[PDB]
Amino acid sequence: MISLIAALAVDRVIGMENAMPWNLPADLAWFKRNTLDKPVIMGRHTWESIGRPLPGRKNIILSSQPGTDDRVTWVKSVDEAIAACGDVPEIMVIGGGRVYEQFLPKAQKLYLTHIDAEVEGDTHFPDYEPDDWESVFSEFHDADAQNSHSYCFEILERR
């Protein structure tokens, strides 16, 4: 099964030109726990922003161009990205906006972090109809000494 994992603020904003104006270590723990030892699919832009391969995860990068980093696997299409993952229990799509948009229709589960922040962004998580999904897990947290804003984790399974 294919799953998407994403952190969205209001209006489904997931990305902008500059660094995000929030500090959320708790989402980073969440992210790590949910993707550990599972193959991750990402678009070129996200790859560039992370800058190194994610440790203890097979890394698949989608690009129309030839790859520039032999440490990861580069694919030229959605279908090949899938095939390069092999036979695994769960494939994680970690971004970005263009990528999620193409994988949403094939995903069976979503791992979302809702952040209570209003930011100007140029990238949005695709629109989804909550009714097509079953909320299997949800858990709210207030901002604290370590997390700049309140947030909520939620796990949705396709009905």
Ligand SMILES: [Ca+2]
């Ligand atoms: Ca922003």
